Amino acid sequence: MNTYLKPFELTLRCLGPVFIGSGEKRTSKEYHVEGDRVYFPDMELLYADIPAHKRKSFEAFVMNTDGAQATAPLKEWVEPNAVKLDPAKHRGYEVKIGSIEPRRASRMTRKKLTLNEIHAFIKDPLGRPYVPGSTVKGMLRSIYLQSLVHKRTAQPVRVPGHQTREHRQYGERFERKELRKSGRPNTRPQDAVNDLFQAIRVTDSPALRTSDLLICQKMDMNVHGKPDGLPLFRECLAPGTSISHRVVVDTSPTARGGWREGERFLETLAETAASVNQARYAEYRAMYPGVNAIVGPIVYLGGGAGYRSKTFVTDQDDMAKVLDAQFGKVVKHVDKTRELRVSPLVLKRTKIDNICYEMGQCELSIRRAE
Amino acid sequence: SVIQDDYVKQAEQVIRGLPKKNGDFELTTTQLRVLLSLTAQLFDEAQLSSDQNLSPALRDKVQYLRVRFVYQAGREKAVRVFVERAGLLDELAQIGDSRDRLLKFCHYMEALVAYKKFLDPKET
Amino acid sequence: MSVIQDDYVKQAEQVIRGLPKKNGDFELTTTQLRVLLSLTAQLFDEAQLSSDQNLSPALRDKVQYLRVRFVYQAGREKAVRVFVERAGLLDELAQIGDSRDRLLKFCHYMEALVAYKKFLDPKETS
Amino acid sequence: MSVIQDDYVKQAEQVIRGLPKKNGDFELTTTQLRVLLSLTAQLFDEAQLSSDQNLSPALRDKVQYLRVRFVYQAGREKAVRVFVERAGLLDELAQIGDSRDRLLKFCHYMEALVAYKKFLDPKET
Amino acid sequence: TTSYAKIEITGTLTVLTGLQIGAGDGFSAIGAVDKPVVRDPLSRLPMIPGTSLKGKVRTLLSRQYGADTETFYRKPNEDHAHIRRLFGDTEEYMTGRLVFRDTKLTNKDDLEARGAKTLTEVKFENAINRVTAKANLRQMERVIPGSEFAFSLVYEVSFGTPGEEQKASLPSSDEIIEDFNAIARGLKLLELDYLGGSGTRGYGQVKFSNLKARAAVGALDGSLLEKLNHELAAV
Amino acid sequence: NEDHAHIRRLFGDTEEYMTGRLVFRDTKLTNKDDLEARGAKTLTEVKFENAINRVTAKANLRQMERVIPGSEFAFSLVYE
């Protein structure tokens, strides 16, 4: 450590799959499955060994103009003219698939879906997956911003209005009131140099290995307990991986660019993670059948975690007016949230053919290591 | 060869003919920032090179650029109309080993992202 | 032809006065023209030392790069977008062609716009 | 319509005594005007040896450039701005259309402001 | 001391999380991101400008000395007499005693030996809303976490600027230990900090390796260079 | 004039060794066309530096010009 800079050790153990998207989505003309495991070859190595007389056909196959109807796999084109997908000539990586399930009574016509699109995890410039430090620090700006609003408040938080523009301007002023508390001598009091989260430095995670990144499917259970398999296959993580970040606090005085009480907040970090767990989504999780409530130092990380994890709204009917200010012509949420008292209307649970559990759960712990 | 001598005049007529929705210009400048960061490094090593014929390493880098223009236009409907109208897959086959074919291609490529920002709103 | 008039110093005074205000202090700074002013000075130092009235082909491909950096810079900034349109800098750059004295005429008009920009603007002068 | 009151030595003393001083000295020194006193010497020595009564277009070209270099220097300096607007130099440079006689009165009035600048304060040796 | 000397301190600077100094802001290429990084103007290699390396270490050392003496140093020339000795000021120590350098990337061929294609990655970030969550995008460019830079700085032992009312003298051998002790204390503070950029969101974690001192000009006192190598042994 | 006797006979003074034995010359940039062939658009770069106030954490920007690396000057020095 140091005599004015105090580090910590933030370790995150994932209980469900974790998906941090990169902005990359792969089509079915790049991979092809073998049983359960799906192979991802290198895109340039399988092109270089192919001779030049068939390269004009391989360019017209990936760029779907005619022939295939943009749903054919790689084995549609490579099986007649047998170019062997060898894992030694094309140094890629192969990995398994969690589960595949159909929908319920959607036409009964028993439709069976396939893996048309796969969203990709964010990777290193070498090719290995990792966890950014901008994602974990955005989680800690929801743990601290819910413990000051779920424990106690002056008024219970009500979103004023119906339009989404006044729903926008309420959120950007509650944070700017509860976190711009530095008090520099001659500046505006709502300036970015007054933000209390400039004294917390959350570094990135070390690079993991791609041997454990399975493919999931978004299954939306309801109050009856009947999930449906949406076409949202994505390359997630698997429960069992340990992610270890480093957090550094700064013990300079306030208005010098420091926060002496963020260190005191970080020593009780597993405590506020449990107190926000019992008050926000332990009672919501107990409504849906077949789901067993855990107490835990439970936090939520990454996409596919739900609307409740990324806000600080408390009341269930308060969440429905803001969701009906951006949606509403598809499915009416206002009348449906007062019949079964739930918000949102589904639960993002997954399956790896063995145990049905949630999407994005983690187990949190910390220590004050030098 | 498709690139003219005055390439700035024909690179502007390509952008005026791109397809549009009820708004305009479904193709953005963020959908091809992985194609722009690979082109902007081929331009650097070709400029620093002194010999006229390309290196063997300066042909494996051009050949990797051509597999990204089909792997990005395949998974995007807006990009594949842009590559086929600007003729980027026809010009990359003309560059066998000549250095001045590369620099004429990289000058024409960066005159397309100039008129891509200028001929529309919504980009800062 | 000839979008720059004679007595261009009077024409450049009216261009800078016709800019949007945004609470007095101008939207356009000279820092937003820094990558453009450093290229026009390199072009002016090479056309001045030459002698022939027709531009060399090693000098006529630096005018085409200069008029493609003007278009890119006007596309991603709205303060520079109106200033380029109000002064007519893209129409003159396309009509330079190959003559030496329609390139020197462009650079003398370019100095008067920067000279009146620092004079008619506070939050400057250091 | 000139600023010169047909004496220009009393008037050049009515400007330097009215310049805004600071706690120590004047805010304007003579090292800031070296780029303008070197271009005005080339206009003096060129217009003197000409026999005509109106300026040549090569001589009329470098009065527009001295007009632009005055505006740029007054834009990026506070002390030169309070000195150009006090003497009335930028309004007088637009009065010289092509007259040789009105150009020579400017150069006489310019060096009467430099002579009293060296005299009315120390730190000019 | 006894004679004039110049001490050269070499080393290696390796990048652990992605670095973005980013002082271009307009000068960079046309096919580039909104916030580009500092590159070399001829060879297009990423660089560390040396002004950012000097100013960061002086900022971290002015807070370490400002917490042990319980005063807030408001500006330079008001710093400690140990920070204003090896970094410069304009009052009584007019020149540095420490010469920093600009640093190009060195292991370009070692990165293309592995599977790295571009020297700088492009990272997409998000800004979510804490009610009815909608997000706006930004794109960041940063140097990849395998890069290595050839760190170096020089240290000068002479009379310096004595002042108009003083008798000039050379710094004793006990004072050169206290100068080198504050260098390695200021280089251990940088391994906790982030060397320019976002930093609090995971950028710019950096590491030092193989720090050793030489005697480039003139001889030293004797059994003094080996105890300057021991102050640098703990980074 | 108080320097060493080996410095004042090479560089000169105004008391004993009136003129130095060394003549320095001004140098100009030679490899301009070599730098333009390797891709230099300008012969000088502009560097943006930034002083940070320690109280308000504000920004005091400045622009500095300098000769780019790789430039090469012809050196000459005469002895008598």
Side-chain angles (χ1 to χ4, degrees):
Chain A
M1 53 175 56
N2 204 271
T3 339
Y4 107 102
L5 234 53
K6 305 300 179 299
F8 294 91
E9 283 195 313
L10 179 63
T11 310
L12 306 182
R13 191 60 186 269
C14 49
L15 303 183
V18 174
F19 174 72
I20 303 180
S22 174
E24 179 81 14
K25 180 253 307 171
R26 304 171 185 176
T27 345
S28 184
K29 296 171 171 54
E30 186 178 331
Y31 56 90
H32 96 281
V33 304
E34 182 173 23
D36 271 333
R37 311 194 71 167
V38 36
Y39 177 53
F40 290 106
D42 283 4
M43 53 190 64
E44 64 137 32
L45 293 186
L46 87 105
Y47 179 84
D49 62 328
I50 283 183
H53 61 265
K54 277 188 62 208
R55 284 175 180 172
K56 199 258 178 183
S57 182
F58 188 66
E59 288 171 8
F61 168 67
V62 180
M63 304 188 305
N64 190 87
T65 60
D66 279 321
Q69 297 199 255
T71 46
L74 190 62
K75 214 178 182 181
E76 176 84 16
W77 186 84
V78 86
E79 197 164 342
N81 16 86
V83 175
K84 301 179 300 301
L85 270 310
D86 210 321
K89 291 285 189 175
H90 326 302
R91 191 184 182 180
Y93 66 101
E94 197 182 276
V95 84
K96 58 185 173 303
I97 285 173
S99 184
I100 163 179
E101 290 294 325
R103 292 173 164 176
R104 188 255 195 271
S106 189
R107 71 181 78 101
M108 300 180 176
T109 305
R110 282 302 104 200
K111 298 146 56 184
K112 188 58 66 186
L113 309 178
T114 47
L115 277 85
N116 200 31
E117 291 174 335
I118 288 181
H119 300 269
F121 206 85
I122 174 173
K123 298 185 170 59
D124 259 72
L126 299 191
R128 303 162 302 190
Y130 80 112
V131 176
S134 173
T135 305
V136 191
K137 201 204 175 186
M139 178 182 61
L140 298 184
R141 212 179 156 91
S142 290
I143 300 174
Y144 179 78
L145 222 47
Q146 279 161 357
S147 69
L148 306 185
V149 90
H150 244 300
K151 171 249 309 168
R152 287 299 175 273
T153 164
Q155 48 90 71
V157 167
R158 307 156 301 186
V159 171
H162 318 276
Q163 314 303 305
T164 187
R165 274 80 52 191
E166 61 191 298
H167 297 173
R168 206 269 313 174
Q169 286 201 343
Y170 176 67
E172 58 102 5
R173 294 170 185 167
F174 207 100
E175 312 188 57
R176 213 160 296 168
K177 181 188 59 59
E178 214 67 34
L179 278 171
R180 303 282 170 95
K181 299 175 304 190
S182 298
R184 293 196 174 268
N186 35 323
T187 18
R188 294 155 309 274
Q190 278 73 30
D191 203 80
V193 300
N194 297 288
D195 197 288
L196 282 201
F197 261 81
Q198 73 191 349
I200 296 180
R201 294 97 196 260
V202 185
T203 68
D204 286 7
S205 70
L208 307 179
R209 40 188 175 269
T210 178
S211 304
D212 178 85
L213 294 158
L214 38 81
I215 281 92
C216 298
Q217 190 191 21
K218 185 180 182 177
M219 273 159 292
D220 273 7
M221 304 192 62
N222 42 15
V223 292
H224 323 299
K226 300 173 185 303
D228 60 324
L230 288 89
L232 202 38
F233 295 91
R234 44 158 93 104
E235 180 184 5
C236 310
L237 264 160
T241 53
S242 180
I243 316 169
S244 60
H245 297 254
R246 185 186 84 178
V247 189
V248 176
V249 87
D250 169 50
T251 67
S252 296
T254 330
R256 299 188 191 178
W259 193 16
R260 286 202 191 91
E261 316 305 314
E263 166 184 289
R264 195 253 292 106
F265 162 72
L266 281 180
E267 298 192 25
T268 66
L269 186 61
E271 312 307 304
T272 177
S275 297
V276 83
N277 180 80
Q278 308 282 93
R280 188 162 188 87
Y281 29 67
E283 60 273 56
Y284 169 75
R285 197 174 178 253
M287 170 73 72
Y288 296 93
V291 196
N292 310 276
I294 330 175
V295 263
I298 300 297
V299 295
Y300 288 80
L301 185 62
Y307 172 78
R308 190 178 282 263
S309 168
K310 315 246 160 52
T311 49
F312 42 58
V313 196
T314 57
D315 193 285
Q316 294 175 344
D317 217 337
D318 216 305
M319 305 171 184
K321 40 176 295 178
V322 279
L323 282 172
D324 283 314
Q326 47 177 358
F327 321 111
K329 72 195 66 57
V330 187
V331 167
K332 312 293 173 299
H333 286 193
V334 260
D335 65 328
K336 204 57 173 54
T337 190
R338 55 183 179 92
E339 296 168 11
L340 6 148
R341 54 201 293 175
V342 278
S343 192
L345 271 67
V346 287
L347 192 51
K348 266 70 55 179
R349 274 156 58 91
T350 354
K351 185 55 155 204
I352 53 143
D353 313 316
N354 291 6
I355 306 108
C356 301
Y357 36 65
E358 308 181 61
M359 178 78 214
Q361 267 197 352
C362 294
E363 183 92 345
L364 190 133
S365 54
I366 210 181
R367 62 198 53 85
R368 196 173 183 172
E370 63 187 18
Chain B
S1 300
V2 206
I3 303 180
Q4 324 270 49
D5 284 329
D6 196 279
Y7 56 91
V8 198
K9 197 68 65 176
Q10 71 134 332
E12 187 254 11
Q13 294 293 329
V14 173
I15 310 296
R16 288 188 183 271
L18 289 182
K20 52 199 65 191
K21 59 180 304 176
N22 299 273
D24 208 316
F25 287 146
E26 284 195 342
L27 166 76
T28 71
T29 188
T30 78
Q31 293 174 327
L32 29 78
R33 209 167 295 274
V34 75
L35 294 175
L36 276 169
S37 295
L38 287 179
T39 316
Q41 207 191 18
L42 236 183
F43 174 75
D44 298 355
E45 301 179 13
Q47 189 79 244
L48 289 175
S49 61
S50 301
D51 52 338
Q52 170 58 40
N53 279 334
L54 291 179
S55 310
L58 269 173
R59 297 189 206 178
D60 297 301
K61 195 182 295 295
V62 187
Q63 281 288 305
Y64 178 70
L65 187 62
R66 206 161 64 92
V67 318
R68 288 300 302 180
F69 272 106
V70 289
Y71 264 75
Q72 195 75 211
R75 59 152 135 272
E76 208 85 11
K77 189 173 57 185
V79 177
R80 89 165 180 262
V81 197
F82 167 69
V83 185
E84 290 300 318
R85 194 155 305 186
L88 295 180
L89 286 177
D90 315 8
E91 181 53 47
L92 278 176
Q94 266 77 280
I95 314 170
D97 43 3
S98 181
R99 200 189 77 165
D100 67 326
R101 300 181 195 271
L102 237 183
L103 307 180
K104 194 155 55 185
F105 170 70
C106 297
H107 284 347
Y108 166 71
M109 186 63 180
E110 71 186 33
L112 284 168
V113 299
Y115 289 102
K116 190 52 195 57
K117 303 214 171 186
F118 184 76
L119 283 178
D120 65 330
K122 310 282 179 50
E123 309 193 13
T124 320
Chain C
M1 307 300 114
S2 173
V3 82
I4 313 169
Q5 307 176 198
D6 46 325
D7 194 16
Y8 55 89
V9 196
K10 196 60 66 63
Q11 188 184 182
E13 180 212 334
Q14 308 166 0
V15 165
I16 307 299
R17 282 204 159 99
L19 292 187
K21 290 303 180 182
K22 192 52 182 178
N23 205 343
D25 301 323
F26 281 82
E27 282 169 340
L28 175 68
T29 340
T30 69
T31 323
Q32 295 166 307
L33 315 166
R34 176 55 50 195
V35 81
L36 303 182
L37 288 179
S38 59
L39 291 180
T40 319
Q42 182 73 210
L43 238 188
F44 182 74
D45 293 356
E46 285 235 348
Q48 193 70 40
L49 304 176
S50 64
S51 56
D52 51 342
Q53 297 185 8
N54 287 87
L55 299 181
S56 61
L59 209 69
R60 211 165 50 182
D61 45 1
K62 304 202 303 178
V63 190
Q64 300 300 318
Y65 173 71
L66 184 62
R67 69 179 291 257
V68 93
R69 201 56 192 261
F70 258 103
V71 175
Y72 173 73
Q73 200 69 217
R76 67 178 189 89
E77 288 284 324
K78 205 164 190 171
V80 197
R81 187 153 187 160
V82 191
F83 161 72
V84 162
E85 195 184 62
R86 209 68 72 93
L89 294 173
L90 291 179
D91 322 338
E92 174 57 42
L93 271 171
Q95 294 172 9
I96 286 181
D98 60 325
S99 86
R100 186 185 172 270
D101 224 325
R102 293 191 311 269
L103 175 58
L104 296 181
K105 193 75 177 185
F106 173 75
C107 299
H108 288 310
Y109 181 53
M110 195 64 181
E111 296 186 292
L113 291 168
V114 192
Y116 272 97
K117 192 56 186 56
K118 309 198 64 172
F119 181 68
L120 303 179
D121 193 19
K123 311 302 159 295
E124 279 229 0
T125 323
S126 185
Chain D
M1 295 177 299
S2 173
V3 203
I4 299 178
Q5 51 173 61
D6 215 277
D7 187 78
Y8 75 83
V9 194
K10 158 184 291 185
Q11 187 187 12
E13 203 191 10
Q14 289 173 181
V15 174
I16 317 294
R17 289 199 180 274
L19 289 187
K21 293 186 182 179
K22 289 206 64 59
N23 44 13
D25 305 300
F26 285 88
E27 59 177 81
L28 168 72
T29 182
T30 191
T31 324
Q32 304 172 196
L33 297 172
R34 186 52 58 192
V35 205
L36 295 175
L37 295 178
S38 298
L39 288 181
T40 329
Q42 271 287 334
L43 261 187
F44 211 178
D45 306 0
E46 187 69 33
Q48 193 76 209
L49 277 81
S50 62
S51 305
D52 305 71
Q53 212 61 268
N54 50 324
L55 293 180
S56 174
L59 225 159
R60 202 170 168 264
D61 256 359
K62 48 183 60 179
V63 191
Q64 293 279 273
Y65 193 76
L66 189 53
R67 181 181 162 182
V68 169
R69 205 58 168 87
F70 258 104
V71 175
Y72 172 71
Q73 190 64 226
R76 65 167 177 92
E77 211 58 50
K78 180 175 177 55
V80 186
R81 183 197 303 262
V82 86
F83 162 71
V84 162
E85 79 189 12
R86 199 71 67 95
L89 301 173
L90 275 181
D91 45 71
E92 198 172 358
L93 279 171
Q95 305 293 139
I96 318 168
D98 55 81
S99 178
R100 186 184 165 271
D101 184 67
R102 282 180 290 188
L103 186 64
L104 292 172
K105 285 191 177 184
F106 179 79
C107 304
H108 292 322
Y109 178 61
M110 189 68 178
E111 61 171 35
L113 295 164
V114 184
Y116 274 108
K117 177 60 198 179
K118 294 273 295 179
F119 175 69
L120 283 182
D121 43 302
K123 272 73 53 177
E124 319 261 355
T125 64
Chain E
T1 172
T2 49
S3 62
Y4 177 81
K6 272 183 175 298
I7 303 174
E8 174 101 18
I9 305 180
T10 345
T12 302
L13 190 58
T14 165
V15 162
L16 298 183
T17 66
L19 178 85
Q20 182 207 56
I21 290 166
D25 295 7
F27 190 76
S28 297
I30 168 170
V33 84
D34 308 64
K35 307 173 188 179
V37 298
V38 173
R39 294 173 183 266
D40 194 65
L42 184 65
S43 55
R44 248 86 58 166
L45 287 178
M47 211 187 57
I48 295 181
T51 61
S52 65
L53 181 55
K54 182 184 181 185
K56 186 64 173 177
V57 177
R58 190 176 182 160
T59 311
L60 297 179
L61 274 180
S62 68
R63 301 195 182 103
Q64 183 63 259
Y65 280 93
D68 305 8
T69 58
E70 291 290 332
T71 169
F72 178 59
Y73 298 142
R74 192 157 304 268
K75 69 184 200 299
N77 309 6
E78 311 184 5
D79 276 327
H80 201 269
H82 293 187
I83 309 176
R84 274 165 44 244
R85 181 200 299 165
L86 14 147
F87 306 93
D89 64 273
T90 49
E91 302 296 285
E92 53 194 23
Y93 313 95
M94 297 231 55
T95 338
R97 297 189 192 180
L98 276 181
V99 177
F100 286 78
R101 302 295 190 189
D102 306 16
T103 322
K104 294 193 192 70
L105 185 136
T106 66
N107 55 328
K108 184 197 173 185
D109 298 5
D110 191 70
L111 288 172
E112 271 93 47
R114 316 194 199 102
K117 304 171 182 303
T118 324
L119 284 177
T120 55
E121 58 159 344
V122 173
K123 185 182 181 304
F124 294 89
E125 293 194 345
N126 230 6
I128 214 180
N129 205 331
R130 286 305 193 274
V131 50
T132 176
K134 310 177 64 179
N136 42 334
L137 284 165
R138 67 186 178 273
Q139 313 155 335
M140 315 298 293
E141 184 191 13
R142 56 180 192 174
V143 195
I144 64 173
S147 308
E148 240 137 20
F149 295 91
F151 174 78
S152 174
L153 49 85
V154 207
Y155 183 86
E156 192 206 33
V157 181
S158 61
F159 281 98
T161 301
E164 200 63 78
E165 298 296 314
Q166 212 256 344
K167 206 267 180 182
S169 61
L170 289 166
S172 63
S173 78
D174 204 14
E175 198 175 316
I176 319 180
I177 312 295
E178 302 176 11
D179 298 337
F180 274 66
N181 183 80
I183 292 174
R185 175 151 33 90
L187 291 180
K188 272 191 289 297
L189 286 167
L190 195 57
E191 305 192 287
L192 301 180
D193 282 287
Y194 46 83
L195 200 62
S198 299
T200 64
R201 271 147 283 162
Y203 283 33
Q205 204 222 343
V206 98
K207 190 75 186 68
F208 286 95
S209 37
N210 306 281
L211 299 187
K212 52 178 59 67
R214 299 195 304 113
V217 160
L220 276 178
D221 184 275
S223 74
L224 183 58
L225 188 62
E226 61 168 352
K227 65 166 60 70
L228 292 174
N229 277 113
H230 192 260
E231 308 293 305
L232 301 175
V235 189
Chain F
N1 281 100
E2 281 179 46
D3 281 357
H4 200 259
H6 291 5
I7 309 299
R8 288 188 289 106
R9 74 185 183 190
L10 274 182
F11 300 94
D13 72 319
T14 178
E15 301 288 339
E16 176 168 56
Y17 310 91
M18 295 298 300
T19 319
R21 299 174 188 174
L22 284 171
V23 174
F24 285 80
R25 308 288 204 186
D26 299 356
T27 85
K28 292 170 187 55
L29 180 61
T30 62
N31 55 340
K32 178 191 182 179
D33 15 69
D34 183 276
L35 287 177
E36 295 180 296
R38 299 173 54 186
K41 290 299 178 62
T42 42
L43 290 176
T44 41
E45 62 157 344
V46 181
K47 186 185 181 182
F48 284 79
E49 288 171 50
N50 170 262
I52 289 178
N53 181 260
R54 294 187 181 179
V55 174
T56 62
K58 283 304 171 183
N60 317 320
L61 212 72
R62 67 182 177 271
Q63 300 172 351
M64 313 282 291
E65 186 194 6
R66 55 182 197 171
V67 186
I68 63 175
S71 300
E72 162 171 335
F73 298 87
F75 176 75
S76 50
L77 173 66
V78 201
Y79 183 85
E80 196 206 22

